[PDB]
Every structure is written in C-alpha cells, then in structure tokens.
Amino acid sequence: PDSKCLKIKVKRINLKCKKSSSYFVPDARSRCTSVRRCRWAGDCQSGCPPH
Amino acid sequence: LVHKPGEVVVSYGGMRVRPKCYGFSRMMATLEVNPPEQRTGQCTGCHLECI
Numbered sequence: 407p408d409s410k411c412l413k414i415k416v417k418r419i420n421l422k423c424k425k426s427s428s429y430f431v432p433d434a435r436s437r438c439t440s441v442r443r444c445r446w447a448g449d450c451q452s453g454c455p456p457h
Numbered sequence: 458l459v460h461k462p463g464e465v466v467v468s469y470g471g472m473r474v475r476p477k478c479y480g481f482s483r484m485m486a487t488l489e490v491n492p493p494e495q496r497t498g499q500c501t502g503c504h505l506e507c508i
Contacts, residue, residue: 443462446462
C-alpha cells in the first residue's frame with residue numbers, strides 16, 4: 407500500500423567555479439657558484455665550447 | 458715543472474680559506490623525522506546563547 411521516501415536537503419547555494427587545472431608553485435631563491443682555472447693546455451686555447 | 462693547475466683556494470661565505478684537501482664524495486648521514494600525529498585534532502568547550 408505505501409512505501410518509503412527519499413529526502414533531499416539543501417543548505418547553501420554558493421557561486422563557486424570549476425577546476426580548469428591544478429598545480430603548485432614553490433618559493434625559489436638565487437644560488438650560484440663559479441670556478442677560476444688556467445688554460446695550461448690545449449683545452450682553453452681560444453674559446454670554452456668548441457661548437 | 459709537473460703538469461697541474463696548481464693550488465686551489467676556495468672562497469666560502471666571503472672569506473678565502475686554504476684547505477688541506479678538496480674533493481667531492483659521498484657520506485652516510487641521517488635525516489630529520491617529525492611524527493606530529495595529530496597534535497591538535499579537535500577539542501573545544503563552548504556554549505551558545507540568544508539575545
């Protein structure tokens with residue numbers, strides 16, 4: 407004769423957006439080092455990279 | 458004269474130091490382990506009143 411029901415509860419209706427993409431950008435700094443050498447051979451005749 | 462670039466001096470932290478030996482190798486070490494394990498999960502004692 408009768409049956410159960412299915413209740414639908416609504417609390418808030420906000421104006422949200424979708425998710426086009428997701429990523430994480432970390433904080434970065436500036437770090438660098440160098441080295442001073444002498445030619446002393448045929449390795450540093452004219453330029454450092456040959457081609 | 459032997460074939461070598463000579464002695465090497467390294468400037469670390471603005472100061473020039475003359476080390477005894479200079480090389481790059483591996484070394485066994487440990488890491489920091491922070492097991493917080495829900496330090497402050499949920500705890501609050503409050504009440505509600507009407508005006």
